[PDB]
């Protein structure tokens, strides 16, 4: 490559791999989105919530691919693993899956930052610092608040809670 | 002082002391504000409520300092005591602390008005009458209403009440 | 904490401690502000200058608290130490105190960045890099210029210099 | 009088007397105003400053007369004493006269408030509290600042100070 400079093969490969993980996360959000649209689930706000995350994850991989091409990397794509569930339970359950997924994504981001720091690649460091690390933190905090609000709305009158949360917290 | 006129040293000292109390109240509101922002508390409206009070108390001391300088007083600052709790419980609990704090502030305001009346200082009297006494009364009444609304929302389905109050009464 | 990830207890504690230092700096700026408002000091521009710094330091701690909550930290507040002087001398003197305070703040910021780098916490690194490090540098440079301008205006006709500086350099 | 109610003859007489003092103060400000307009004094800003005070004192007596008529009082006017000097010296000197005059006015205002409080006349109390007491305090504080600024500009290069003050502090 005629543009490539200070761009280790390890980083290139780990970017290809983070891209696959973005694609898979996106795909999971797509599943959660349509699940909450079913006539027998019917929580529009929750569906919108997850559909937006599908979009946000797509922006992620799109940006990772752009950076790949900018540094002189070559994108290689693998199969995209189907999401881990077909049915997502109730809002708390799905929000826990989301949380656990975001936690996984943030770990790979950190791992790639560690790896890039270890190759002394300040561009990669800066790039992650700018477009990803704060976004993940904000997103995780929001899911925390969401889980604390659902937890608070739980108990005997539980189905009532789900309704109100979707209506009064989630944009619809 | 070349401007000082009808401004007793007692008033000056009690103004310095009311200023410390404003600073401490502000500081308490700051604590309550961020407490309700934690991922495991997550009541945005309650957080906004207390953050606004931090701001309102700051306006108070700022105005007390300005008056000090206008009368020819000299501001002296002491250490600011940390707030009385680190964790603030639930909304009712925190609203009770707020109430008790406002009650303390209103007592010092009254005490300073009594003291100023006793030094026949009608400027100080007018100044408190204009910028403080009505504000405290309005604020206390509001906290009363708040406490009556939380009390009404209490009981078995209690966590549901907190949610609704924060959503339907508090600006977010 | 359900959101906490890659957030060492050391950082959390050092953030609580940097927050106390912000609160104390803010408090010092408040003192310098009202000092320059006294009838016997009467330098409006200098007062505005320091009052703005009180505000800027407050933004600092407010942002540190927000980050604390975002990472899953728990804010703990200590007493806030009174400022180091009651009377601040002349403009040069007060500007030297300001300089020395800013220097202290910038050192703690650096120390916290070193500590965060040592825990490999790139979020904390990025966060400081974005909201604090450049602000401090700009602010210190400005105080340098201020001190060079007061120094240049010093000497026999010294009280004349203070007046002109406040009038011709400082916004009023 | 068919409207008169809770309006002691003492207050009525002291209002007539405060009115004479307003008229005399106004008259003094008129003198200071034109003095600073002389070709051999020539400080436009200082002249504007005092001319504005002539206007402000006039508003005072006009308002005292209106209140007199509102309470059912009868205005009686005495001769108006000429101002105490024909030549007013330099800016510091004239500003000291202004200060001493304002101090006298504020004392009569206080004395009338004491007298009204002693007749339990809350209207008179409120009226003074609203239209006079804060205005005097603000005005005195400003003259303080003015005197501190002239004092700071004094010394060997003294005539230079007067010029700059008039140019850089006073509206022209």
From Swiss-Prot, chains A, B, C, D:
GO terms for molecular function: ferric iron binding; ferrous iron binding; identical protein binding; iron ion binding. Oligomer of 24 subunits. There are two types of subunits: L (light) chain and H (heavy) chain. The major chain can be light or heavy, depending on the species and tissue type. The functional molecule forms a roughly spherical shell with a diameter of 12 nm and contains a central cavity into which the insoluble mineral iron core is deposited. Iron enters the spherical protein shell through pores that are formed between subunits. Mutations leading to truncation or the addition of extra residues at the C-terminus interfere with normal pore formation and with iron accumulation. Belongs to the ferritin family. InterPro entries: Ferritin, Ferritin-like, Ferritin-like_diiron, Ferritin-like_SF, Ferritin_CS, Ferritin_DPS_dom. GO terms for cellular component: autolysosome; autophagosome; azurophil granule lumen; cytoplasm; cytosol; extracellular exosome; extracellular region; ferritin complex. This is Ferritin light chain. Stores iron in a soluble, non-toxic, readily available form. Important for iron homeostasis. Iron is taken up in the ferrous form and deposited as ferric hydroxides after oxidation. Also plays a role in delivery of iron to cells. Mediates iron uptake in capsule cells of the developing kidney. Delivery to lysosomes by the cargo receptor NCOA4 for autophagic degradation and release or iron. GO terms for biological process: intracellular iron ion homeostasis; iron ion transport. Fe cation binds at residues 52, 55-56, 59, 62. Residues 5-154 form the Ferritin-like diiron domain. It comes from Homo sapiens. The keyword Acetylation applies. It comes from the Eukaryota. Keywords: Acetylation, Cataract, Cytoplasm, Cytoplasmic vesicle, Disease variant, Iron, Iron storage, Lysosome, Metal-binding, Neurodegeneration. It is found in: Cytoplasmic vesicle, Autophagosome; Cytoplasm; Autolysosome. Transmembrane segments: none annotated.
């Amino acid at each position: 490559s005629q543009i490539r400079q200070n761009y280790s093969t390890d980083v290139e490969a780990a970017v290809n791999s983070l891209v696959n993980l973005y694609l898979q996360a996106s795909y999971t959000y797509l599943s959660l989105g349509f699940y909450f649209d079913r006539d027998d689930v019917a929580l529009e706000g929750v569906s919108h919530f997850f559909r937006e995350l599908a979009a946000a994850k797509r922006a992620g991989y799109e940006r990772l691919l752009k950076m790949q091409n900018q540094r002189g990397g070559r994108a290689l794509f693998q199969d995209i693993k189907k999401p881990a569930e077909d049915e997502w339970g109730k809002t708390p359950d799905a929000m826990k899956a989301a949380m656990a997924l975001e936690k996984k994504l943030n770990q790979a981001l950190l791992d790639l930052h560690a790896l890039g720091s270890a190759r002394t690649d300040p561009h990669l460091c800066d790039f992650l610092e700018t477009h990803f690390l704060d976004e993940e933190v904000k997103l995780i905090k929001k899911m925390g608040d969401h889980l604390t609000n659902l937890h608070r709305l739980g108990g005997p009158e539980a189905g009532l809670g789900e309704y109100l949360f979707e209506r009064l917290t989630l944009k619809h």
